Amino acid sequence: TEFRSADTHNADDYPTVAAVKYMGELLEKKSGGKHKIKVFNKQALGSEKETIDQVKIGALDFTRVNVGPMNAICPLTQVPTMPFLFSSIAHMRKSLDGPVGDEILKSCESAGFIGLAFYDSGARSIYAKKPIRTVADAKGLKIRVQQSDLWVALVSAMGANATPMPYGEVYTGLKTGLIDAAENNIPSFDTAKHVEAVKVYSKTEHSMAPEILVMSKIIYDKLPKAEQDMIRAAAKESVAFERQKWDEQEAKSLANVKAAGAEIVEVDKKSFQAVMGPVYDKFMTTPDMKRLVKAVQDTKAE
Ligand SMILES: O=C(O)[C@H]1O[C@@H](O)[C@H](O)[C@@H](O)[C@H]1O
Ligand SMILES: [Cl-]
Ligand SMILES: [Cl-]
Ligand SMILES: [Cl-]
């Protein structure tokens, strides 16, 4: 069959878009040409929230979203969203590739989603019209976040005025001053054109919330076991491809925004980490969540 998958990003070569296209190529190979994936980027099939609901009801086969908008519907996705959980991108990758990530992926089935892969999304940092070097600088800042209660809390802990909005509304919001700031990785800051509106990128690195690729359980459950396995393998094998593309995009977008006049600022990251204890207290509240946070931070470096 020809499966459909959604992505919000406009660029046809954005790493997440390229990665699901690569997954499709692998699936064609593994299935002897039976199965294919068509990737609808440019939010053609809806916002992240909308596509999650379409996958839930089986109208859409796959969606590639960030964990943020999955925080309510698949609560263990909150774990890798948590601020300053991971010590480095290497730590994140090892954690997500191992038993922690695999358990989180499996946990979404209870809500109607087959979790297939985590893709890299770098670290998210504040961008605004002024430098945010300490948490005091963030006080009162009108900053967009994703549609997630955890995210509202995360940024509120900095003293900021968290403003949940869909991704597609952020560019115009920044241009018109409806919002002061937002937060994201550099490729998003670049490719969504947020850098056109605000130039100061303060490296708070306050989350490494990854992307998650999910399939509709309704659709998955009707496929033969052998074909379910092909899909899972193709997704898993696409992660290494996504990461190589992601590394390249990190560099390309950094060059783009520096050339465009962005001011990249180092910050007192401990200032921001020091306010996050209550976020763990208020969100990491179940045995599974506590166990998985601990497993992540018990992970040994290579
Ligand atoms: O902030 C957002 O809404 C966006 O952030 C990006 O990092 C992510 O790649 C998008 O899928 C979307 O979640
Ligand atoms: Cl395609
Ligand atoms: Cl969106
Ligand atoms: Cl944001």
From Swiss-Prot:
GO biological process, one term: transmembrane transport
Biological function: Solute-binding protein that binds D-galacturonate and D-glucuronate (in vitro). Probably part of a tripartite ATP-independent periplasmic (TRAP) transport system that mediates solute transport into the cytoplasm.
Key words of the record: Disulfide bond, Periplasm, Signal, Sugar transport, Transport
UniProt protein name: Solute-binding protein Bpro_3107
Cellular compartment(s): Periplasm
Amino acids binding D-galacturonate: H9, E48, R64, R124, R144, V145, Q146, Y167, N184, S188, E211
Cellular component, GO, one term: outer membrane-bounded periplasmic space
Subunit structure: The complex is comprised of an extracytoplasmic solute-binding protein and a heteromeric permease formed by two transmembrane proteins.
Organism: Polaromonas sp. (strain JS666 / ATCC BAA-500)
Disulfide bridge positions per record: C74-C108
Molecular function terms from GO: carbohydrate binding
Residues the record lists as binding D-glucuronate: H9, E48, R64, R124, R144, V145, Q146, Y167, N184, S188, E211
Similarity comment text for this entry: Belongs to the bacterial solute-binding protein 7 family.
Stored InterPro entries: DctP_fam (IPR018389), TRAP_DctP (IPR004682), TRAP_DctP_sf (IPR038404)
